[PDB]
Amino acid sequence: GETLATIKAQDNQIGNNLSPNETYPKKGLSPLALNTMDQFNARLIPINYDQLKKLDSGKQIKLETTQVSGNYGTKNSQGQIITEGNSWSNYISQIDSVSASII
């Protein structure tokens, strides 16, 4: 019932590609490590003494994803593919507004 830390994925945890119906890392590999909390990947994620004593029981730490950032692909003046200044959050709100969701 309390959030220990909210972590945004830095360089070590960014996935370069993610196709539909796939994962990062891929199906045959082992999961990432979400070690650090600062921007330059040099500050680990601390808990205090009461939270550590709470962990030394049945209590489990849950993980919720509150958002994801990422780019899409577009072709520039040449035939190249540019995915740099192309954010998906520019359209996450607009798509959710003019649509019906089906799962």
């Binding site: 309390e2 205090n48 709100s93 607009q94 959710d96 507004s97 003019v98």
Partner: protein, 51 residues
């Protein structure tokens, strides 16, 4: 005025609807402004006494 309501979008863009589709249709009237009113609320506070 090209922007009567004082917001980043002109009167034609707001009247016709050539703006963010997540904008409420209230703000599609050139007199009502597209305007976010964001505020933060604290839910609980944790204290870590570093003895």
């Amino acid at each position: 005025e090209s922007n009567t309501a004082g917001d980043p979008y002109t009167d034609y863009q707001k009247a016709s609807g050539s703006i963010d589709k997540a904008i409420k249709l209230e703000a599609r009237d050139p007199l009502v402004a597209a305007y976010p009113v964001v505020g933060v609320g604290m839910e609980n506070l944790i204290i870590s006494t570093n003895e």
